[PDB]
């Protein structure tokens, strides 16, 4: 299914715009989106293995991909965790399913957010990447209200060939990211 809005948006819109704002010399220098990643701090589902499957399967739909797991390693006496056992959710997506997800993001997820205001422009890693946090996961389309046993939160990131956050800021804004100016 190699075809979509954001697909060409980067090409026939953002690509030349980047050549305007900074001007390059080669197509492999122009800041390319190429890696989206999701994460969930599940110190909660440590007890219930059941609650673990739920988060992953809700995740599989929203990500439009296959979910994954990742346990701790040097863990919290303070919060009931110790070695290789508990859990942490993660799912990396690229290529096509990457764009399809970005679509649901700034066209469905971001809009119906609890008093959405914009994405904090400080959330740049200083380099050419961006990380953002999100509470309710039901803000996604396919997610039904009468199905979420808990408002499990999660935070996503995105890698880019960008080497400066200015390039990132311009690149993401052109991509349609509602930055809280």
């Amino acid at each position: 299914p190699l075809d979509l809005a954001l697909k060409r948006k980067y090409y026939e819109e953002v690509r030349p715009e980047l050549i305007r704002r900074f001007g390059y010399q080669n197509v492999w220098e122009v800041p390319r989106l190429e890696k989206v990643v999701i994460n969930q701090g599940l110190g909660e589902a440590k007890e219930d293995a059941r609650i673990l499957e739920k988060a992953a399967q809700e995740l599989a739909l929203i990500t439009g991909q296959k979910p994954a797991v990742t346990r701790a390693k040097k863990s919290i006496s303070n919060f009931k965790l110790r070695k290789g056992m508990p859990i942490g959710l993660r799912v990396t997506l690229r290529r096509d399913r990457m764009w399809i997800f970005l679509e649901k993001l700034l066209n469905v997820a971001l809009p119906r957010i609890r008093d959405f205001r914009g994405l904090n422009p400080n959330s740049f890693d200083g380099r050419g990447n961006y990380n953002l946090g999100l509470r309710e996961q039901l803000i996604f389309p396919e997610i039904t209200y009468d199905m979420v046993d808990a408002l499990r939160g999660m935070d996503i990131a995105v890698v880019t060939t960008a080497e400066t956050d200015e390039e990132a800021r311009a690149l993401l804004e052109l991509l349609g990211f509602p930055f809280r100016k």
Binding site: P1, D3, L4, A5, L61, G64, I100, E103, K104, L106, N107, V108, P111, R112, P141, E142
Partner: peptide
């Protein structure tokens, strides 16, 4: 499959995702 976002405010976009009948609301149209 072409996921037709039927957001209740006047917008039906033919994206790509599971189930074309995607009932949404308050999308980018409003």
């Amino acid at each position: 499959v072409p996921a037709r976002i039927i957001c209740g405010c006047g917008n039906v976009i033919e994206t790509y995702s599971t189930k074309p009948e995607i009932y949404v609301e308050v999308c980018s149209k409003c």
